[PDB]
Amino acid sequence: SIKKPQRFDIIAFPSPRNGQRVAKRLIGLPGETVEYRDDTLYINGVSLSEDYLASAKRNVSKNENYTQDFTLETLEATQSLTVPEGMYFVLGDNRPRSDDSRYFGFVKQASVEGVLT
DSSP states (O other): OOOOOOTTOEEEEEOTTTOOEEEEEEEEOTTOOEEEETTEEEETTEEEOOTTTTTTGGGSOSSOOSSOOEETTTOTTTOOSSOOTTEEEEEOSSGGGOOSHHHHOOEEGGGOOEEOO
16 A cells, blocks of 8 residues: 655655655645745645644744745745646755755655655
């Protein structure tokens, strides 16, 4: 049973940077806009909670946002309105220590070797 990846699934794939196997969370799917504003995830302008980040967000500060403000247009690595056909936008839960789509750009769907459970 190879499940078709859904949002917030954890997926393993070779890094677009160096080909090293890495695990990241599926955040954006083909056709969608992705935005972070004030530490909240917006997909197609729809606010989505991330209860898996709440525990980590307890050790930051009043000032600091755990994830910086961005759109797919703001990011040097993406420069795009939407996630392209046949591609994913992924982010790591340890956000300030994560090499993810914010920095290595979109991930090819075809290169994903599994959903991780």
